[PDB]
Symmetry: D3
Subunit: 301 residues, 6 copies
């Protein structure tokens, strides 16, 4: 049946519009793709996806949209019906998109009130094979979300969107894949919102090199020099000027999308971080707060 196949971008609503714009292009290593009096689009130098981040000047910080990819026009419609069947509020009907790089798609809110987008045939952008030591994002690695009822959110993603379970951290954190990457989405309990967005680095040396630039650029590592167990990926968390959290990650495991057997890792500090030599932890990072405007569009504000 038709399913989500990748993540496209994350649209942010940010107060400190300018500070956040400079961050992504002069600090985080993303490539500007376009600006407008009220918006800004950036893209990952190592991927052909039109844009991976969208910034909209707003009166408050929030996540406007989480855009997922579908293979074809007939796949976008199938998920359109599937979402309806599951009882979701549909904010838009499948049609050519006026947003950058066009594409055919629709929008619907998740059972929690977070706006999502599913689209196909979105224009492609440039893409080069990065050399080692550049310290810049190759592509998006994953997105982590909080949910008031995570078990159900996990099922929506599996039964409606087509994700499959790759791992479990006890019974509170689930890792979901929609292709051969260990996971592209991770669901966690808490108020309906987004926790962080990770970016894939070419190598461990690159994550370090990037973390280094971020340090001199005045941003310290919120939780760094670590390596997770579920997915076995190295990590480095940061807080953007806008107050969001972004992560440089690397070496996430490749699996067989169709046959990977998930495991239930037993919680333990060593399980969250197998290195235990960096600084900070999940406590030095912002505390989750319900995303402003649940079931509301960026417009409605």
């Amino acid at each position: 049946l038709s399913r989500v196949t990748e993540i496209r971008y994350v649209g942010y609503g940010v107060k400190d519009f300018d500070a956040e714009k400079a961050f992504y292009a002069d600090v985080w290593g993303l490539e500007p793709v376009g600006e407008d009096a009220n918006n800004a689009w950036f893209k990952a130098q190592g991927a052909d996806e039109h844009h991976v981040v969208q910034l909209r000047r707003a009166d408050e910080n929030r996540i406007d949209v989480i855009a997922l990819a579908a293979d074809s026009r007939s796949d976008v419609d199938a998920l359109r019906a599937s979402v309806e069947a599951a009882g979701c509020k549909v904010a838009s009907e499948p049609a050519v998109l006026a947003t950058p790089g066009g594409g055919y798609g629709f929008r619907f809110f998740s059972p929690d009130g977070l706006l999502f987008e599913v689209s196909s045939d979105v224009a492609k952008g440039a893409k080069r094979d990065l050399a080692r030591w550049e310290g810049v994002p190759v592509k998006i690695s994953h997105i982590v979300l909080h949910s008031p009822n995570h078990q159900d959110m996990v099922k929506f993603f599996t039964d409606v969107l087509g994700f499959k379970v790759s791992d479990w951290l006890g019974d509170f954190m689930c890792f979901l894949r929609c292709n051969s990457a260990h996971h592209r989405i991770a669901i966690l309990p808490g108020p309906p919102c987004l926790n962080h967005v990770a970016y894939d680095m070419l190598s461990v040396d690159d994550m370090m090199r990037g973390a280094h630039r971020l340090k001199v650029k005045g941003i310290d590592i919120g939780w760094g020099p670590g390596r997770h167990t579920a997915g076995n990926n190295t990590f480095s968390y940061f807080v953007t000027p806008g107050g969001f959290v972004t992560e440089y990650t690397s070496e996430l495991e490749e699996v067989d999308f169709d046959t990977h057997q998930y495991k239930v890792h037993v919680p333990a500090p060593m399980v969250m971080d197998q290195w235990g030599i960096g600084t900070g932890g999940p406590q030095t990072l912002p505390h989750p707060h319900a995303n402003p405007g649940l079931f509301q569009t960026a417009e409605a504000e």
Copy 2:
């Protein structure tokens, strides 16, 4: 049936006996109670338990015994009976104790192999009411253990030894009570071993002054001053010279022993620590390793 009513003491086998010995009497705040060629006893100044810590000069660091209390001599026998039905290896029949403070007790191995002692009528010692600012322990607060089958270890503590579930952190960490204190035992997953032993302080002020003393003695706080959710107690974890970890804690809740309803807390950063302004994390503390000589007594080595 009858049940365990309190914790008496923990017996440690230590490699650097001399250094460990000087730690408890001159840094930690315990009162020397007795000594000999290969052993040393210590008691908390604010409680009349004959002694709360016993050290044995050994070749390898380990836990020799976790000593528990029972109200009566026939309570000790009832517990000998329970253990038998649970199928535990009994190391001693209920008899008069030759250990300091005497008493009537027996020893049995928990399903994982750690050695426990259940006894009653142990000679009381000297006790006095501490004054704010002394910065010394009042009595032992709790003991946390790791178990390869933590669900079973919990049922053992509740069904065999009569403890009761006071709280849960997900499905991986359980808090058990044997009296009005929120807990005296907490089970956690991992190889069969003892995580740490906590000592109750008179006030948050005494934990701070205590932590201060340790700091000037050369011992840094392993997990900065904080406050847990389950039990609402403040904490300060330290590593001893023998490599064991001890914690100064305060304000542990009081509950009705029978009517207290337990809760399942959702794992979250701010759940392990509601303050989040100290240094360290469980990661700066030793990784759990199986206790040397499972199902073996001190004689074994």
Copy 3:
């Protein structure tokens, strides 16, 4: 006689008006009450004082005014006379204030040249009983001032304004009260200026939570968490983006305004901080400097 009964607000002239405006509403925990081109008003959520902070957009950082409260028009007129007798430079006569909240007051310069305001019947704002863990200020706790002639500055607060001495730190720091709070004003030797403004928290836990919210906002603790001796209050000092310092405090002793016996505390390490587990110290906060515009109203600039 007639006297000052409490603190109202503190008016600041800030060069970086926007960063300071954002600091109070999004980090410090105060409630915005009004804004115009060159001004911003903030209120403490746990008190009905119309506003506790006023910020004026300025070319240079300074303290524009420290407003105090009196019980009634009569009391204010009386104090106004008292001020004259003590030979002070009066900047206005008892009249209906035109600032937000209204009221009946007048302004005058302390013997040192700092502008103070005494007023009565200022409108009452809304007030809320905070819940533990919110980490936001309940009310203004105290204000510390520097005076070239502290011995005299104290006499002026006691004899003209009615404040009474609650304690002395050796012979250089005096704590003064004007109600049941140990103190609302403290006098320290140094150029004529304002040292810090302290905000009272519901509990020590709340102080810690506030400190944590600030840590994730990127504002480190200037003088780590501690507990003072005089007044027995816990403290957490911070440097605002505007350059001033603010403090989260709690557990400030309550005393009988009339019969409280003051003590002279002998200066010592353990006297400034009875905990000694945090970081920083007075040596790590900005050095006091004469307040710009002595004996000059904010107009003058």
Copy 4:
């Protein structure tokens, strides 16, 4: 009368003899002078004073004696009277010394219970002009004491022992000179005991070099590099493995012993430390405690 003219040495009773004996010989920079079953003498390489530190294997830490120096054999006698006419218990009648280095002197307890010694003609030891960057002590700089009646205690020092006042920190800390150096003794209120013994370094560079050696050897600065105001000396406090604090100081001002005009400095953060760019503070060093065995010699234990 005649007067004390210089500090000779300090004698400590240390529980952890070995550790401390190692400290001074390899880490601190003092050259050994002679050993024995329970005694170790140490010398400062840049001064002819036979030995500046005496260690005695004891059960609990304590100050056994603070050895001072007199010029002639008869100046001693002239003091033995002053002490008598002061009412001090005398522990030794002027007699030829049986302690390493010989000499003639007596022992008596001061008004607070700390044993002092006054001698003359002790055998000089070797001395070489140290070179910049060696990072070892040149001689002892000063000793700071704690007194329950510091005002009287100072008068004892000035009137009975012949010291003069050089500076006052408010009314709680008095600097006393017995020669050219700004001070060799400083008095602080508190339980009767020694606070720290400070050694002089050839320069600021040597202090840092010195601190650098202590750091690599595992001893962190208790009170970071700073510059005191009273005396204008750079500082660096440390904690010996025995629980005693020592200091590497430099650039202590020289004054005319006779005419030096003393000043009363106003207490202030910037006063204790004019640099304020390091870590620690009195806060992070041992809290004072009554010296064990008041009015008792070491032979009493």
Copy 5:
């Protein structure tokens, strides 16, 4: 012949023009000389140099020009020929300057593409003797450059501009003097660019005082207090809000411009910093990146 005899100023092209503007005035300690819509000039309070820093609102941070001094209007003409004969691209012919303080000079590019300026007779501005503890720059100390062919860059500076070599750190870093100071210029390997601009402090104390100010102002010492071996000057590096690095330096030796003989220090860990006690290190500072627009003026952009 005629030769450069001093450094005048550095002109930066800054993106966050206002943040950098405020840094030099409010934080770094320079004095505003003038401004217009797109430029700001700053002056050292301790040097008659008209100005030592120029900022220009730019799209991207870069070095716009490095201004040098010549003694006479004919020296400038001479250097204008030497530069020509060396193959340097001349950006302007020797004439009266239209920049503040005027003067007579011209602009040419060094062999690597950095725009330089040589001038004479520039108007002197205010000047005064700083007092110990003021914590502000006296004048400019030195400027460090990165060159892809530093051996050639060194020869350019000596054979063309008239600089002399005062020292070598191995064979990768050169120290050049234009007057009595050990060096005003230092060449290092790497892409063509400016490493840092260092400001002279009255004394080591001032550097500490200065650094403490940046500390409370929210700027951490990028490379802790230390002392270099070449020049023996104490150092403290910082990262400006603009992204450039500036250092407070003191005690840089003096030398006989004519006779001084250069040494070749053997690299060694402890040669870069003879104290090795401060925090950070060259690793916490930005990595050298070719100055944007080599061989192009600020206009082209």
Copy 6:
């Protein structure tokens, strides 16, 4: 000709015999091979080398010997004559060794006075293929020595011992190989001594897991985890309780012993460390000191 093919072990004369001895078996990860009252041999678990570390109880710390390995008995004699010719002071004539493991070899002093040993047929010990995450050493990676005439000391290793140059850091640090490993020995300017010994780890993960064990053992990283340029090896430096420095390293390049072209890297922060996010640096490690007893065997003492 016949040449050195590997590093066997290092013998240290350590004053704190018991601490250093505990270090290697309970902290560093080496396995005890032998013991008596004043000696202790240690073995690396991933190599069959009989023992790689030797401790000798001593009055002063020093490098007793640096034992190299030759392929055969004849090979050994060849080198014995080859050493004879270079003019070294032989200390033993080729012959069966009474030391653990036996073998045939001799000891001679290098031009700088360090005592070396070249033996063959030393008894092989047990070896295990470690699994990822054990965090224990596999083998000895390299040894770094200081030389007052480093240039000649290199020719000695290449022309006399048979090593080959794999790289140079500027003209001060040389990297020598005796097989396919990028290097096994590194020479650096300085007083004749041993800088540090490095231990190869199975992977970067194991070094991190190793550094974590040392952290919880109270032994912090002297030079934060990083990555060298020459050899591309990841690093982690530590100071042992005895005062020596050990390094956990990984990913050192494998090269072709014969056809490997070396390079001269230009010194520069990013070259010493390509990551730049750990702590400390060469400066936070002990200063090199001439080795006690130059040209003298352990027996002299």
